């Protein structure tokens, strides 16, 4: 369960990074 | 690199290449390896035995020329050794025995003079250490006089040939030279070369730009004498002793045509005390004809020189310039999966621009906020990449980038304890450090990133010290079997952690895992790595005073009789 | 992306798995994880497809796990659920009213699917009805139509009146009090009836209990 949670967190972080990049491009 | 090992005499640590078993061999203190059985043949793929054999074969070419040694080795391959008896029984051997006594003779016949002397001073008691340079330049005569001695601290010292070239560079680095120097104490006379041999190539229409007469105020003041650059192309493999050397390094950085010189002229720019070249060697930061590694060690100049005083943060803008190496991360890192990264102009050079930063961070402890800001942006670039062949080298030497960022960042040492409550760093840095625990590891046939991401784990947990977290991965990671690389990655870090750890138990369990793990070759790897890093420091309290290790020792001797001929010279070194 | 696809896959895998511990963990995840905003409408689309399919497989456990997953999304303060309210309502309503949610065992299993589905519709009403206008009239018309149809089984009726009952005290007074006497004469029909037996005993106990205990507070 802990591992799964960690994975989810990582995914969220990645998404955030992507969003930031998009904003910069705009 | 072979020079590094041939600068070693007096117990440590050099060997002959031509190893002739003679009866009267009285000096075997340093030669322990004969060449007798088995593992003493195996151990002549050590670096001296390879690339010093390489070195001597490259020399002998230049003396016996290349076309001639071509005709030599092409005959040797197709020269036939037959067997013929008088009842007509025709035998054929080549793909069949050939001899080395007639090899000697064949090359001797074709080309060359005395090769017995020359090769004797590669194997026995020969080669030099240091070349002394001193300089003059007399105005009245225009004769520019050089005094080159040479010096070799060891039993059995002589005077040696080594073609030692010098090329003097006029007011605008538009000169010439030559030289030779091959006797012990020589003073050599370099004629009225105010105007170079290349007087008008376009060399000196540079001082013949308008610096012949306008700066005759500072050529007729010859107090800045003609700048004698020293040892082109590592022309003789020595340690130079040459006062006042900043201009010489620059002139070799800019105007030398062979980059063998340059990469060594910036190893010397790195180390020897140099005034401001920083803006000038950015030429060779982005000279797009140059090697991966000269662009690298051009960054590593600014890394080593590391401020000197309190213009530490004036270097740095030039570093973060190529911290974005034209990094276009508004399409990246989604179209850098699709690209090959354009090598990012060698990721040897990208590594050592945030590692110029990191060395500077290490060396002076009033950097560290601004470097951290810098390398925080490198971390924002990361965790958006996929697998791509070339980009392994980027990832692998960016984990050395990210190590020595949290490393200074908690260099308030006194143990690790816990690093108190630096969640911001420890979390995020461990997030890149560890593997994606969803991601299966049965798919990549290579593993680089997570080989050096256990190294990002260690060294950020070595500069403080989280002891028993580190091996508690690497034991598990060398049991499960999958991934030959991963296993060795783990086992190299289980011995990098014993290199720090000094409770006796860990070394016991380490020579147990030496004994039976039971891949034989990873067994060697570990055994040599424990034989390299010693278990003692300066102090000498009970030196080498064991009884059971010496039983294991003799029982690891004559496992040559079984196989691994790199195990028994493991024993041979720890005897 | 690789990480978002992996966590999507893992949560769907955990929905069908007989590991009720691992589905419960997947529910917690879908209510608690940030970053999920892109893995909305792929979730919801794969939930709603799975709710169709599992209605036509009678798999109560899958259906309760999919209701719980919609609830988790709706409760997740890092997911802007509004846009997809208009998808999640007719899926949840299909679970409340469905002619083939057979609640065929022990009432506890599939009474608890109609009931749980209705509690999610009741949240959605109490949170979105003001903002959307469309939503209240669409839901109240479909539930009132069910409950008041003579020709809709006990099971469909009890589901619709449980939903009505829990929407709002002001819905209880306005729809369900005036309908009360009319529906007990016409469609006592014992529950619309058999349909019934001991499930108008327990389900028209529960209806008379939830009617008494929303009548008493709409008076008070």
PDB file of C-alpha atoms in Angstrom, chain A residues 1-16 18-19, chain C residues 2-4 6-8 10 21-22 25 29 32-36 39 76:
ATOM      1  CA  UNK A   1       0.000   0.000   0.000  1.00  0.00           C
ATOM      2  CA  UNK A   2       2.783   2.402   0.970  1.00  0.00           C
ATOM      3  CA  UNK A   3       4.576   1.735  -2.317  1.00  0.00           C
ATOM      4  CA  UNK A   4       1.384   2.429  -4.261  1.00  0.00           C
ATOM      5  CA  UNK A   5       0.910   5.719  -2.415  1.00  0.00           C
ATOM      6  CA  UNK A   6       4.479   6.748  -3.225  1.00  0.00           C
ATOM      7  CA  UNK A   7       3.927   5.965  -6.904  1.00  0.00           C
ATOM      8  CA  UNK A   8       0.763   8.071  -6.932  1.00  0.00           C
ATOM      9  CA  UNK A   9       2.624  10.988  -5.358  1.00  0.00           C
ATOM     10  CA  UNK A  10       5.356  10.735  -7.989  1.00  0.00           C
ATOM     11  CA  UNK A  11       2.760  10.771 -10.767  1.00  0.00           C
ATOM     12  CA  UNK A  12       1.141  13.875  -9.286  1.00  0.00           C
ATOM     13  CA  UNK A  13       4.512  15.627  -9.138  1.00  0.00           C
ATOM     14  CA  UNK A  14       5.174  14.778 -12.783  1.00  0.00           C
ATOM     15  CA  UNK A  15       1.786  16.185 -13.782  1.00  0.00           C
ATOM     16  CA  UNK A  16       2.511  19.410 -11.904  1.00  0.00           C
ATOM     17  CA  UNK A  18       4.187  19.271 -17.052  1.00  0.00           C
ATOM     18  CA  UNK A  19       1.630  21.961 -16.226  1.00  0.00           C
TER      19      UNK A  19
ATOM     20  CA  UNK C   2       4.133   6.555 -17.815  1.00  0.00           C
ATOM     21  CA  UNK C   3       3.392   7.333 -14.122  1.00  0.00           C
ATOM     22  CA  UNK C   4      -0.196   8.541 -14.679  1.00  0.00           C
ATOM     23  CA  UNK C   6       0.609   3.127 -14.329  1.00  0.00           C
ATOM     24  CA  UNK C   7      -1.476   4.543 -11.440  1.00  0.00           C
ATOM     25  CA  UNK C   8      -4.597   4.465 -13.612  1.00  0.00           C
ATOM     26  CA  UNK C  10      -3.168  -0.166 -10.880  1.00  0.00           C
ATOM     27  CA  UNK C  21      -8.437  -4.659   1.101  1.00  0.00           C
ATOM     28  CA  UNK C  22      -6.816  -3.518  -2.232  1.00  0.00           C
ATOM     29  CA  UNK C  25      -7.053   1.163  -0.733  1.00  0.00           C
ATOM     30  CA  UNK C  29      -6.197   6.790  -3.142  1.00  0.00           C
ATOM     31  CA  UNK C  32      -6.639  11.547  -1.165  1.00  0.00           C
ATOM     32  CA  UNK C  33      -4.092  11.758  -4.022  1.00  0.00           C
ATOM     33  CA  UNK C  34      -3.408  15.134  -5.648  1.00  0.00           C
ATOM     34  CA  UNK C  35      -2.449  15.412  -9.355  1.00  0.00           C
ATOM     35  CA  UNK C  36      -5.319  13.112 -10.510  1.00  0.00           C
ATOM     36  CA  UNK C  39      -7.045  10.809 -14.708  1.00  0.00           C
ATOM     37  CA  UNK C  76     -11.386  14.732  -3.595  1.00  0.00           C
TER      38      UNK C  76
END
